[PDB]
Structures are given as C-alpha cells and as structure tokens.
UniProtKB/Swiss-Prot annotation, chains A, B:
The keyword Iron-sulfur does not apply. The modification N-acetylalanine is found at A1. It catalyses: 2 superoxide + 2 H(+) = H2O2 + O2. Palmitoylation helps nuclear targeting and decreases catalytic activity. It comes from Bos taurus. Its main location: cytoplasm. This is Superoxide dismutase [Cu-Zn]. It is found in: Cytoplasm; Nucleus.
C-alpha cells in the first residue's frame, strides 16, 4: 500500500535492492544497483510481474495511458518511465527518484509489475526514431525483479 | 488483474512455477514444484513480497482477518492458508487448488505477496500445540517467490 520493495537479478553480475515509499502523491524510489558498467542505464517499470523467461517475460514498459516513451520529467511518457540511473566508476548506481506518475495503489499501481535496469542509457524519447518512442534505445535487460509489498 | 504468476526458488534444489487465474469470486491455482521430498508440504501466501533476505523476509501467513492458522476448507484460517501440495516419490508436486478467499484484486489481493512451499506437511491448524495455530508446523521455507501480474 505505502511501501514496496524489489530485488533485481539477472543472468549477469547486475543486482540490487530497490525500495518504494508513497509520499503525498509521489513514490520515492531508493536503493542501489551494483555490477553495472560506469555511466547511465535505463530504468523502467515493465507491465508484467512474470519472471518465467527471465526479464524477457516482463513485457513492455508499463503504459496504461498508451503514450509514447519519454523521460520522467516529460508530460508525454509511459507511466513506467523512470529515466536513467547513473553508476559510478565502481559500478554502483545509487537510486534516488521522486516520481509523481507511478503509484503503489489504484489504477497506476506498480505492485506486482517488474522493475528493469538496462544495458544502455535511455534517450528519454527525444531521439525521434521508432525505437526511441517505445523503449528509448536502452538495449537489453540486465536485471529485473517483481515489485512486492513491503512491511 | 485476472492472471498472476510466481517463480519459486530457494537455497536448495526446490523449483517451480505457480499460475493463478481469477474465475468469478475464486482463484484457480495450478503449476508444478520439483525437488521436494515425497509427501505433503505446506503451501501459503505470506504477507510481504520482500525477498531481500530470501524467504525469511516474506513475513507471516497473509492474515487480514486476524484469524488462527487452518486449512483452506476452514472458516478459521489465514487468507494465505492454501494447505498442502503433495510430491510423489520422485519429488514432483502438481498444484491444483481452487480457493474462494484469496483474490487477485481488491483488499485480499495476493498480487505482490509471496508464495512459499515448506519443508514439512501443514497439519492444518489441528496439531494441538501453539505452533499449529500459527504455522501448522510446516517448518522451514524451502522456496518462494513474489506473485506478479501475468499477461
Ligand atoms: Cu525498461
Ligand atoms: Cu508458509
Ligand atoms: Zn517507456
Ligand atoms: Zn496460516
């Protein structure tokens, strides 16, 4: 309801624990992802909490409003579009995102969906090519986990 | 949501995929678990979809009505009390459960909670000790996963 958690795992070395907390009409996303290459990595909620085929079965970006892909600060974005996390030289990205569109309740609830961190930076839907309007050219899914209710 | 899914894993060899489907006011639970010892094994929805410390962080049986532990056919049961799955001599359990109390939406939704399969049979709350009324003496948590929305 007010707190959620996600453990991201994959076939490679990328892992992390993400926490979610409802604050006013926002959700605060914190935690850290480890094992990344230094630099930016796309970071989105995908539609399905389905880990039967790794991160592949998570489906596309959570997009209940049928909008094009964007950055978290854009009006035109998927609900799940949380932009980029940035990993330091040691491969650690400290996640600190305050987002007004995702929710832990109601129609926009991300409970039971999947958090995904990507191989490449998210171009935030500015590129204008076809792939940018769906995924932001973030490339493959390095690690993922199902978003669960937390104590 | 009308469909849900769970991938079970643990520290040992126990693995399986559980599927959930809403039909009217019931949820149909199906799937398979391998790597179990022969015989019965407790099978419950636990409160938190928190895998940060393996199955230990899932918390207790999901219990919004503050009842004692029981079997799924009892009124005096936890919402998460789905009884026993049964593994054959080869360690394979076929899951086939129809339950009217768990739900995939609303107040008793198990989306974002944790499915857990246990070391020992669930005595269904009729073991005669204080432990029976809490866990059914199912023992340790062999494998678990967070319940996610499925396509
Ligand atoms: Cu993504
Ligand atoms: Cu249990
Ligand atoms: Zn997107
Ligand atoms: Zn119970």
């Amino acid at each position: 309801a007010t707190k959620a958690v996600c453990v991201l795992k994959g076939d490679g070395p990328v892992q992390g624990t993400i926490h979610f907390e409802a604050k006013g009409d926002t959700v605060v996303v914190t935690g850290s992802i480890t094992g990344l290459t230094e630099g930016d990595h796309g970071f989105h909620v995908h539609q399905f909490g389905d880990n039967t085929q790794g991160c592949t079965s998570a489906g596309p970006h959570f997009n209940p409003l049928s909008k094009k892909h964007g950055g978290p600060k854009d009006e035109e974005r998927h609900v799940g579009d949380l932009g980029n996390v940035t990993a330091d030289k040691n491969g650690v990205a400290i996640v600190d995102i305050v987002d007004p569109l995702i929710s832990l309740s109601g129609e926009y609830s991300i409970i039971g969906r999947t958090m995904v961190v990507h191989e490449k930076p998210d171009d935030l839907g500015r590129g204008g090519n076809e792939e940018s309007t769906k995924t932001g050219n973030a490339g493959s899914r390095l690690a993922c986990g199902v978003i669960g209710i937390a104590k």
